[PDB]
């Protein structure tokens, strides 16, 4: 993954995201979020999801929290308190740690100001911690805004590399485009049933039909939105609906 001060942000659209694997996999050490109930991810449908993946230190996962102070939360990646999404943090010691001392992933430590919600700043400038300009030189009261991680093979929980990806579900004026599928049951015939064919609802009894839909229509009707023929969204066949008997 990316560094915490340069977290990899990707915009995701028009993908049928099955969050069931996310909901069930134990590979994710952290699945702790509040924006959406974890069981309703498939049903709720959004647009232009933002996946921000990075590698941090183990103890920094609590830094990722709305209205929370810290080091990487206020200097590397700030979360607005109106988060609608989730955070996935999992231990990856064998993935991003080295026996000789891993120092690849750096983290911002000193910043002149705070960070805006969902703001990414890649500024690499000398820090003026005193009353004299540092001129890009580490003099008196002059330090480095970034520091390095200390991943070691014998490091326990809290120091090992943690891979964290945050998913932000934004619902703006554009039509929603990212969400999972709906389970399709087995088809029955010749029985008074009720159905939800591809979003078109109705109660009746279905039979095999011989009508020839022209290759782009979906369903047919006779008079005043009284649907008579439908096409199954799976096998591409034409059935017809008649009402359940009464009198």
């Amino acid at each position: 993954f990316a560094s915490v001060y340069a977290w990899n942000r990707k915009r995701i659209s028009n993908c049928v995201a099955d969050y069931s694997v996310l909901y069930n996999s134990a590979s994710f050490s952290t699945f702790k979020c509040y924006g959406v109930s974890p069981t309703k991810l498939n049903d709720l449908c959004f647009t232009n999801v933002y996946a921000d993946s990075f590698v941090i230190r183990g103890d920094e996962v609590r830094q990722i929290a709305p209205g929370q102070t810290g080091k990487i939360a206020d200097y590397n990646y700030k979360l607005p308190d109106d988060f609608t999404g989730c955070v996935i943090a999992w231990n990856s010691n064998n993935l991003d740690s080295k026996v000789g001392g891993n120092y690849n992933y750096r983290y911002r430590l000193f910043r002149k100001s705070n960070l805006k919600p969902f703001e990414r700043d890649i500024s690499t400038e000398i820090y003026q911690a005193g009353s004299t300009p540092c001129n890009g030189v580490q003099g008196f009261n002059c330090y480095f805004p970034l520091q390095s991680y200390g991943f070691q093979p014998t490091n326990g929980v809290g120091y090992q590399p943690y891979r964290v990806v945050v998913l932000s579900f934004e619902l703006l004026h554009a039509p929603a485009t990212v969400c999972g599928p709906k389970k399709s049951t087995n088809l029955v015939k010749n029985k008074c049933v009720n159905f939800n064919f591809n979003g078109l609802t109705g109660t009746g009894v279905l039979t095999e039909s011989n009508k020839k839909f022209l290759p782009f229509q979906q369903f047919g009707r006779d008079i005043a939105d009284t649907t008579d023929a439908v096409r199954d969204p799976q096998t591409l066949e034409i059935l017809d609906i008649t009402p359940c008997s009464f009198g």
Partner: protein
Amino acid sequence: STIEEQAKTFLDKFNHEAEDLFYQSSLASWNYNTNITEENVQNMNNAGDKWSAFLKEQSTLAQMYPLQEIQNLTVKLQLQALQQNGSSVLSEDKSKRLNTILNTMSTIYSTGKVCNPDNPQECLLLEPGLNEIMANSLDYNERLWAWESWRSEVGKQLRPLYEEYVVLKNEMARANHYEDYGDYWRGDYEVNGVDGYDYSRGQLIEDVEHTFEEIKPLYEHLHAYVRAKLMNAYPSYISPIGCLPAHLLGDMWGRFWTNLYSLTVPFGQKPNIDVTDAMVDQAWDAQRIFKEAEKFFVSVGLPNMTQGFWENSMLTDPGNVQKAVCHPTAWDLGKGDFRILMCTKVTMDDFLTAHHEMGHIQYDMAYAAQPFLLRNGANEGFHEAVGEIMSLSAATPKHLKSIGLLSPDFQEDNETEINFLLKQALTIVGTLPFTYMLEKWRWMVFKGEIPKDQWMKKWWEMKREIVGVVEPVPHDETYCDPASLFHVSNDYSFIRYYTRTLYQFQFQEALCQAAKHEGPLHKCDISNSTEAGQKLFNMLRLGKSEPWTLALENVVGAKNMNVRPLLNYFEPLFTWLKDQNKNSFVGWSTDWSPYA
């Protein structure tokens, strides 16, 4: 910008850039002390030289900060140790002279060898051999000759070297804003911060004898008991008005009186609690012993261990040529790595030592939440006292019966409990006069009250007067007795154990009082006592983040020194001593001497 923010930024940079370096140094030291190899030699060399070389610049930055206005008491607390001059204000000549003097003292102390006049081609060293032969001998002549040989082929040359070291270190203190080296040593038990919790540097000087004088009845009764045993022993050597000699102290210096157990047996027939044979009959492996100790620690309430300690560290029987020195230690490597170093064996002494080292581990993890600069206790007395609390708590018969070791039908009576109390006191309270007089001698020599000529005469005079140990043969000025010691020739503080005994007994009594236990304190078990564990957790977790007097506020409600727990523990023993030697009178005469 304000100076406090600059100091905080300096701390944020320095702790981060020093954590990795000290972690590497600890890794190298542990690797050598576990995987002994020639490569590990230069491993520690090149991982420990960098520590000092980097701390050089770390202290170099800590001079531009005016450490007289930083507030909140937190930045100042760390920066005071960071802004420590120590031995960095010298010229090359004096510094190299001090280094050479320490080197020659160490070499002479570590080269100790004694050969008899008849055969000078086979000497024996301070390692077992001479030591075991003389400390557990049967005749007087070999003990006297061994004492003379050690005092005449080790400490004879060290008089001028010790004098030069003492004066040079006093000059070090004077150039480093201290009147004495003893003042620097006493600066540990002192805080200059919060009002009402302050302790002065000169307070300890009076307080040591203030808390030492109350054991004078117990010490004198034990001394009279030992004297009566000696008179009943080999005669024409002990007088009813004198005291016990110097070479019959059970040791070289009389520092520890554990080996005098057999000669001063009150009952003798009744044995102590020792079911090591029951353990080996149960065929317990060392992991079972460690698991039982962990179960006791969890029953107390101390936090659980993290995984990795039981894996990366060696546990038992290293075996083949890849040897491992196993001095009992609880290695605080840090950065999610904490280990132990021990030759764990199935024996009660090893069981108590494992409890001691696991208690040291628990204390070290207690202040682990502190930053790098403050991952240690407020004073040197808390560490070993915490270590020995769970050593004292694992000796009660009830715990041994509860771990399925003692017999279910093993009942406790007066005789065995009294014997256990007496044997515990033989080592615990049998060293305080010697420690007090040694610290007094060091304070006097660093202050300079006594002149160069009146060093050893005064030492032996206050040994006869306070401790009660006499001159076997006369030595005036050509034998340097204190330099023939580990803590005097290695520059290690000895008040650490003096405060450690008081701390451990105070904490033992505190947990026993707040553990819902009634009866003798020697049978008090802190196992399955959640309130005692809560108290110990709430206290030990602070570390050095709080002053020692402020630290002396949670386990015991008293911030002052009280010797009362020491007498509280050994109350039945003193009560029996009040009637055993009801004929011989306690005390001794200084004018009496073996030769005079």
